[PDB]
Amino acid sequence: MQNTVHIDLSALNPELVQAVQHVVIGPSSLIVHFNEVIGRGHFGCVYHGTLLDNDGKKIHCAVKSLNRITDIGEVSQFLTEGIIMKDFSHPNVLSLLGICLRSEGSPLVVLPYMKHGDLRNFIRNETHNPTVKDLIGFGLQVAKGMKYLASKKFVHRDLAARNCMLDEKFTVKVADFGLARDMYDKEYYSVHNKLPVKWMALESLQTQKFTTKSDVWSFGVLLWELMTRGAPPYPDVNTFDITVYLLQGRRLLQPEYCPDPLYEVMLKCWHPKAEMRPSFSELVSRISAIFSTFIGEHHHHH
Numbered sequence: 001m002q003n004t005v006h007i008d009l010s011a012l013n014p015e016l017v018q019a020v021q022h023v024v025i026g027p028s029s030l031i032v033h034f035n036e037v038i039g040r041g042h043f044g045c046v047y048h049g050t051l052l053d054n055d056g057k058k059i060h061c062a063v064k065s066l067n068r069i070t071d072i073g074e075v076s077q078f079l080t081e082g083i084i085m086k087d088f089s090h091p092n093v094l095s096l097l098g099i100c101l102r103s104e105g106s107p108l109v110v111l112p113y114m115k116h117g118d119l120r121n122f123i124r125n126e127t128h129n130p131t132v133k134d135l136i137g138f139g140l141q142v143a144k145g146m147k148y149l150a151s152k153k154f155v156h157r158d159l160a161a162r163n164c165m166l167d168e169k170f171t172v173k174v175a176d177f178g179l180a181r182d183m184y185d186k187e188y189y190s191v192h193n194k195l196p197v198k199w200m201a202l203e204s205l206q207t208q209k210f211t212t213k214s215d216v217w218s219f220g221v222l223l224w225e226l227m228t229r230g231a232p233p234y235p236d237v238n239t240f241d242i243t244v245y246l247l248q249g250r251r252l253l254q255p256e257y258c259p260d261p262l263y264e265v266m267l268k269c270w271h272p273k274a275e276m277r278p279s280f281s282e283l284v285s286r287i288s289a290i291f292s293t294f295i296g297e298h299h300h301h302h
């Protein structure tokens with residue numbers, strides 16, 4: 001059975017195994033509420049969990065597990081989704097609590113619990129009803145998280161509202177790193193070995209090369225999701241037809257209640273020339289200026 005699966009750590013890249021050991025959680029310190037599914041990632045389901053800290057205090061966490069354990073390659077990619085987050089320390093980026101792996105079964109990627117859940121379902125919720133200014137503020141928070149990520153030379157590749165979480169203080173955190181890659185000193189990441197077609201930059205669709213500038217494009221799509229309150233992008237355009245649609249200069253259209261200065265920012269994110277797109281630092285500056293000059297009702301701290 002799957003519960004008897006044994007992972008041979010000798011088969012993985014030593015640097016990965018060392019990184020996993022550096023964030024190891026002993027099995028006696030973790031309780032997985034396996035009967036309480038809270039979400040899903042690219043590799044499996046997410047469950048409620050309880051961690052016991054160094055002083056025996058209970059910490060509410062989220063636990064990702066690997067749904068399919070048939071090959072080492074998938075095990076490697078799953079552990080990497082946890083490992084890429086190891087040194088993350090920013091208010092708008094989800095931190096890694098650790099990784100638990102015993103003799104049998106799935107490795108377990110442990111994360112802080114995010115009270116309000118995913119950003120997409122949050123903004124779609126008729127109760128929540130966030131104001132226009134609250135939405136711009138969430139967009140600003142995401143830009144701050146991405147400025148941090150790009151500074152560490154990591155490329156997200158999957159920035160979408162679905163992949164962001166809100167904690168008890170309504171702090172938005174970029175949460176899923178299932179496709180994120182270290183750019184090292186290359187300033188790009190090319191496909192070797194899922195891809196979000198409707199959030200991808202035109203050049204990534206064409207060449208399968210990813211950069212911070214293609215993350216800027218995805219960010220623009222995220223802003224559009226925020227301003228439409230979680231509407232699906234290009235609903236009348238097929239995935240396979242997106243490349244041509246974008247080649248023709250067509251873009252996501254201005255959401256009904258979106259301020260004109262914020263739509264202009266979105267259009268800058270979708271410039272056909274990646275070098276012409278603003279950086280994350282510039283996006284933080286521009287959005288902060290729009291947020292501070294849109295005088296409307298707002299409830300959260302951004």
Ligand SMILES: O=c1c2cc(CS(=O)(=O)NCc3ccccn3)ccc2ccc2ncc(-c3cnn(C4CCNCC4)c3)cc12
Nearest residue numbers: 038039040041042046062113114116117162163164175176
């Ligand atoms: O599940 C998660 C989670 C999920 C991901 C994957 S993703 O969702 O960012 N991408 C999605 C994805 C990735 C790849 C492929 C497809 N989809 C990444 C990190 C986390 C981390 C913590 C977390 N905390 C709370 C809740 C939670 C859940 N409900 N509530 C509350 C419970 C009570 N009512 C309101 C919500 C809180 C859910 C989660």
